[PDB]
RNA sequence: UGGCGGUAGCGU
DNA sequence: GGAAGATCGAAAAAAGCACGCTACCGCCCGCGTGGTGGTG
DNA sequence: CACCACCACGCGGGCGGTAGCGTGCTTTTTTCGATCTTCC
């Protein structure tokens, strides 16, 4: 199985899961970890936001790579975003603060 | 774009604020309209429109709804310890009986009887309405908590308790005040208000976030949380329409009740009653659910997410790929690398538009072969294999592109990834920028990793064929063809080979010219004549020139190919290196092609010897038997002597068939016979170590021997018959059951070493090297291990690649050895060994004082390179992916009266104080009495450690032989050593009171034994048993040296024989006292968790003299008198904890009173950081050992100083910080810094220690905390505190999605915290 | 888990799924049958004065 | 056409830097267009810089010294236009 | 154009 | 020299239980009342 | 054209019942009534 780029979840934004449907391996916590353990960082920015949930960054890379130009924009994941409205629907207050 | 993440609970008013509409019906969607109902859970005009890039606004726009009655937060209710509870100081029980309209609560007592807070039922409630009723207030439900959260005052209420606090004394409510004091203090400094934590307003999900997807049925998901909302509002709306009827108490009662169980169901279903239960019958998924658990939010879709750009395919080998290269599928290339076909097409204008590109794509045109090769010429690709244990699970490769549809390997690099050929899976993934790909290059390439970061031993040894290759290539016949003539150069031995003249083990002389590096560092050639074989010759041609000829000479083993190649990377260098294996893999193959080697029926030979050894065994077990029928011997000895029996049998059978396996070969010379090694495929296959081992050939050809019953205990019967024979059913269904538990412990040792590497990783994710030098003189001694009879780790294996603490004497000149900051490498390892230094003290991670990390120099070496460790170095989660790899290799299941010197030199003794007995031998009157057997180059070949009342063979400072006793004891009972010699007399144990005597078992003496407290009555446990050695004069005589007079008190159930009266001498034995862990992952886990021992051993807090006191109810009271200081310590200690120290005896501070396991918290209380780290890295090296696993020290005192991270104050001094406040260390110090350079005084702290999660979840950013576990509590505690988190870490900036800062991104963000500074 | 003795003639002691259900589900034998009440019962040969 | 960038990381020092610098530099001659100051075997950008850095003619220090001419050159280009 | 649950299997 | 303090043992409650992948099925209100359309 | 049959439907929630349901893990924290102690 080999997959570029196909369908995202409505949730998560994120691709989706399995062979029958057009999905990418999942690059869990071990791997994650393997990178940190290298001086892997913008991998680990690339795996985490510019492939799987930035959708602006993934149109962007996507872009870039069609006309020659191998850079990032690594722009803010979905996944926390939905994280965050699922904490605000609580009580409980929280935000991203500049200063 | 932002800094730190805040968070705290939310008022109201920014709740109404997020809201961009009100929710008033509970209709989501209309089957026949397929249009959103006005006011519902997806109505348009409050989450915004369905359609129009994309509609964001249905993804972040919020709702609310405005509760009728106040509801109370269940996170801030149920979740231990209850905030409002804490807050409020009432108990819980009467908080959520007053919520859920059972019991009434008064708000303002006024001038009636009753005071503020109480309770009061219906009866109650009518009685104090019919006796009093004028202007109390007693209110019921979640609006009387709001209203006794918003009358109290948190500043006078918090002072009044601080100044309570300065005059209490009891402990458990001094930790109850001071956690109430920190939660008032956490609420008055924040914005927050105890009031907020009623509900009142209710936020809504954005519709988007809970979709209601179409079934193409015409029906619909479940979506819980959209059902939980409608059941709230409908609740909401009941409850509305009944307040505006003007409803009775009951009425309105039930409906507020109701609702609030909706709302906690909603917010947290099943917290605290039963969960509500769907069409599928199992409880809904609430808002708490999809954010804790291993597949909530955090764990699911933060820390780990599926990723463009990648492919899975099964493995298969490639002989021919270089170390460096790997087979990638064309069609699973092409589909990886379609936007690159893309721009490349577009470039070199084959196509108009990027459609078009497509086009020419997937129908798989001429050039697009051409424009993938283009390409992938140099663009590197991950592989990794499913469970990622350690770093080098993912490593980075050249794709050369192959034919069908599997991904092929390069063999050398198959251990790195623990990966075998029989249907195992890898995942490809793509850079695509030129950073990653540069990364891929340089960190991630399999030629950068050569050496294990656990260890530092090399990863890329040859295994199967090409060890067998090389065995075979390099192997000496005696009449070989072609044997005797000499050859010009490998190439004329080459040529001889391949054209059939020569046999490759004719032992010929071959002129060969091999380079040497001299002092300058080039090469000079030196040509000369070998003895050697053509085998040999021909392998001397991949040899690189700086090497020498020694290497392969020989038989070239597993051991020798691995030998080699680090001799080549040590003196060449890496790329040679990398060229070197690969010629070696190749040529490994190539000649165990030739060979042919293969394994037959007739290979594994079966002597007629182990036939009559079993035979004899037989008869042997036969005469055990009968003996044990005649009644001389009985079951349990008799069942040793059959187990022994068996064993020689087996161990005889096995030296047998090895001894004919390997000298079978009996050949002739070109005139008589001679006794080679033997050519037999599975004997060269054992010797060689391509595969199997001793046991398993042994197994194969000889008797498998004994084997054990799944309780744990041994067959009498073993098994008798080899594989090649014929096993009967016995001896299958007995082995059934060790294959059985062994392939159970592999099944479910996965899951705990799993939760263990992730707790590992968790605790030490954000520790990263930040500094070069903290310029600290102290470090951590280290010195061999040595455990009664071995050495298990030299100096030299403990030092290596550390760095100095201190100046290095050398022993017994008083001069430097090596500079006090330089770095120990191979050199000055052996500098060290040959002047025969034992203990160096060296800088260690544990005692680093930089703060927020580690500095380069605490640390050490890489144990990845060869020069030191870089700054920005993830060590901490290098050291947890150390630890945690070999997890899978460890095990759960569950399952002397002397010293023996062995080597030869003189003994030392430690802290030993002891008298010459009457015969003139030394017994040591200590109980902590160490020795030590120094060599004669002074170091501790061997430690003992000798019990109380021990004979001495021969006294200190003087040599003996090995093979010879030194001391003898008798561990059954612990004898008494007096050091005076006089009369002996009793004192105050007279018999019938409190003590008794008994009659012996054959002699008939009459001894006297010391009944126990609580046996004995009243009458006799008010006074002690009293042995008194007096001199001629009449009195007791004083111990020299102490003016308290030498009475012994005799301890519970005390036997003594002599009668009084009877003169004794010094040394003499008085009273005799009677004397009475399993797995590998259990124990690793326990160690790292500090979790308490089920029998702590207990140890002397304080130095000084012992004492006993009133036996209480069932168990004694213990006082320790120091000599100058003050005596308030008391101790309560059990009867069944055994007493090592007896009445009158002087203790130490950390010493052993009671025997058993050792809780490293008391040992990092009484002796200090140190000794607990030594404690922790000790028990874990030895549990690893067991296992033969070798990992460095570094590691685990990463690990240790992860948990010692927080310290306790004493004295609060100048600083503001509480006195009973537990405050991480760092800022403790900082505080302490500060206070010094502006002159007043700092405040005392004590450090503790805490498990892994403990420590994981107790730490400064919330985030890592709430990811971690636990997530509710974590949130909780981080709302009701107002905590502020910078992500300063790996996990908060891996959840964020920004640059960790530790490898490439350390850089960026250094110049982010400069930027941010100026 | 674990293969008891009483398994002989009853439960296969190999025939059992490698993963974490193994020993969990087992294989009946050749021979193997039940009771009236549902126990396992085992073919034997009656041996009489030897 | 490159296996091993040992030598280049004993250039660099710390295997840190280098790929940062081996990044900006491939991002140049990639976008920048800048002309390789080594000859190209048929290789990839990041390729050419990690060889060009290999003889000392890439670095930190030279790069930024470089970057700052040609940003002088522009700005005096851009003063001159304007006058 | 998704989720939950159960079952079986593969690689460790 | 009898009730707060300290202990303490048992009961309850909460948290956790490796990763990646493949295939299949079963299910995704309710119910039982009433408004309203058809009807002998 | 008032009576039966079809589909909205409405609030309802644990279901079905003239009551229970539950039943093979380990560790940590709370807590709560019972017990012994000691001094104001
Ligand atoms: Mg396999
Ligand atoms: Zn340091």
Known sequence: HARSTGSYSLVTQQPLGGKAQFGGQRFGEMEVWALEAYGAAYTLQEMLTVKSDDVNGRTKMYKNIVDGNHQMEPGMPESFNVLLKEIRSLGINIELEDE | EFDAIKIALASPDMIRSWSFGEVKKPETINYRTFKPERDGLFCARIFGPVKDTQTKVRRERMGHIELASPTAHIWFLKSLPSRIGLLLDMPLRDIERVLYFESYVVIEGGMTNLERQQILTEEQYLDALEEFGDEFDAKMGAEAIQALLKSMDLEQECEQLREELNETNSETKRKKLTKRIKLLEAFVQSGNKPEWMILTVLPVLPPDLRPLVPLDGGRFATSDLNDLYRRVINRNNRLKRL???????????????????????????????????????????????????????????????????????????????????????????????????????????????????????????????????????????????????????????????????????????????????????????????????????????????????????????????????????????????????????????????????????????????????????????????????????????????????????????????????????????????????????????????????????????????????????????????????????????????????????????????????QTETVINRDGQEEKQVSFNSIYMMADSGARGSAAQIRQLAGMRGLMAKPDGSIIETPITANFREGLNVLQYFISTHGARKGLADTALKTANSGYLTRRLVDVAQDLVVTEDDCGTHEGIMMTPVIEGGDVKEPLRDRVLGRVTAEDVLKPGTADILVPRNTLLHEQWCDLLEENSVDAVKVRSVVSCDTDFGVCAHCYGRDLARGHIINKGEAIGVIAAQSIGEPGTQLTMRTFESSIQV??????????????????????????????????????????????????????????????????????????????????????????????????????????????????????????????????????????????????????????????????????????????????????????????????????????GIVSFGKETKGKRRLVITPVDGSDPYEEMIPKWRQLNVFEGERVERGDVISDGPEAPHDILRLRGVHAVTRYIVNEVQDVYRLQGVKINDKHIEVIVRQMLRKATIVNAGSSDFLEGEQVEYSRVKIANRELEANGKVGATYSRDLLGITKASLATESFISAASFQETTRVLTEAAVAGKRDELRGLKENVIVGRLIPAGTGYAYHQDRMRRRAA | RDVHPTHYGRVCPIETPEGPNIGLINSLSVYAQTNEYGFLETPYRKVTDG | ARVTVQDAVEKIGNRFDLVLVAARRARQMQVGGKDPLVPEENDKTTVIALREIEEGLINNQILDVRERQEQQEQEAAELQAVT
Request: hydrophobic fraction near 40%.
């Open chain 2, 243 to 661: 307040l505006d009827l003007a409803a009775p108490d009951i009425i309105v009662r039930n409906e507020k009740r109701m609702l609030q169980e909706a709302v906690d169901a909603l917010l947290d279903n099943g917290r605290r009653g039963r969960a509500i239960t769907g069409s599928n019958k199992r409880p809904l998924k609430s808002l708490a659910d999809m954010i804790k658990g291993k597949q909530g939010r955090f764990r699911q879709n933060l820390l780990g997410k599926r990723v463009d750009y990648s492919g899975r395919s099964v493995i298969t080998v490639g002989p021919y790929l270089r170390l460096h290269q790997c087979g990638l599928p064309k069609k699973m290339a092409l589909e990886l690398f379609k936007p690159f076909i893309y721009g490349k097409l577009e470039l070199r204008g084959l196509a108009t538009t990027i459609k078009a590109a497509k086009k020419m794509v997937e129908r798989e045109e001429a050039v697009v072969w051409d424009i993938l090769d283009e390409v992938i010429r140099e663009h590197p690709v991950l592989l990794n294999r499913a469970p990622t244990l350690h770093r080098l699970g993912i490593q980075a490769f050249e794709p050369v592109l192959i034919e069908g549809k599997a991904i092929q390997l390069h063999p050398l690099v198959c251990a790195a990834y623990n990966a075998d050929f029989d249907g195992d899976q890898m995942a490809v993934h793509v850079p695509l920028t030129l950073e990653a790909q540069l990364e891929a290059r340089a960190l991630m390439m399999s030629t950068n990793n050569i050496l294990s970061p656990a260890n530092g031993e090399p990863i890329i040894v040859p295994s199967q064929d090409v060890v067998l290759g090389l065995y075979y290539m390099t192997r000496d016949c005696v009449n070989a063809k072609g044997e005797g003539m000499v050859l010009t150069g490998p190439k004329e031995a080459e040529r001889l080979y391949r054209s059939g003249l020569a046999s490759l083990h004719a032992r010929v002389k071959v002129r060969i010219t091999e380079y040497e590096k001299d002092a300058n560092g080039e090469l000079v050639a030196k040509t000369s004549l070998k003895d050697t074989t053509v085998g040999r010759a021909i392998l001397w041609m991949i040899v690189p020139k700086g090497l020498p000829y020694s290497i392969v000479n020989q038989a070239l083993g597993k051991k020798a190919i691995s030998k080699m190649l680090n001799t080549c990377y040590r003196i060449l260098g890496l790329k040679p290196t990398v060229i070197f294996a690969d010629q070696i893999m190749y040529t490994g193959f190539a000649y165990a092609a030739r060979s042919g080697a293969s394994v037959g029926i007739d290979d594994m030979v079966i002597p007629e010897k182990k036939h009559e050894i079993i035979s004899e065994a037989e008869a042997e077990v036969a005469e055990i038997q009968e003996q044990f029928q005649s009644g001389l011997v009985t079951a349990g000895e008799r069942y040793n002597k059959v187990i022994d029996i068996w064993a020689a049998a087996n161990d005889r059978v096995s030296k047998a068939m090895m001894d004919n396996l």
């Open chain 2, 902 to 1103: 062995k080597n030869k030199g003189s003994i030392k003794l430690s802290n030993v104080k002891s008298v010459v007995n009457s015969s003139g031998k030394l017994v040591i009157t200590s109980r902590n009495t160490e020795l030590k057997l120094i060599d004669e180059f002074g170091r501790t070949k061997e430690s003992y450690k000798v019990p109380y009342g021990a004979v001495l063979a021969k006294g200190d400072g003087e040599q003996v032989a090995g093979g010879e006793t030194v001391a003898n004891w008798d561990p059954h009972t612990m004898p008494v050593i007096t050091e005076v010699s006089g009369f002996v007399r009793f004192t105050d144990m007279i018999d019938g009171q409190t003590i008794t005597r008994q009659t012996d078992e054959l002699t008939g003496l009459s001894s006297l034994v010391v009944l126990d407290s609580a046996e004995r009555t009243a009458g006799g446990k008010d006074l002690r048993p009293a042995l008194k050695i007096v001199d001629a004069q009449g009195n007791d005589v004083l111990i020299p040296g102490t003016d308290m007079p030498a009475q012994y008190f005799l301890p519970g159930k005390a036997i003594v024989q002599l009668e009084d009266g009877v003169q004794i001498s010094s040394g003499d034995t008085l009273a005799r006292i009677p004397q009475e862990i399993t797995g590998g992952l259990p124990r690793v886990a326990d160690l790292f968790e500090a979790r308490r021992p089920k029998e702590p051993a207990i140890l002397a807090e304080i130095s």
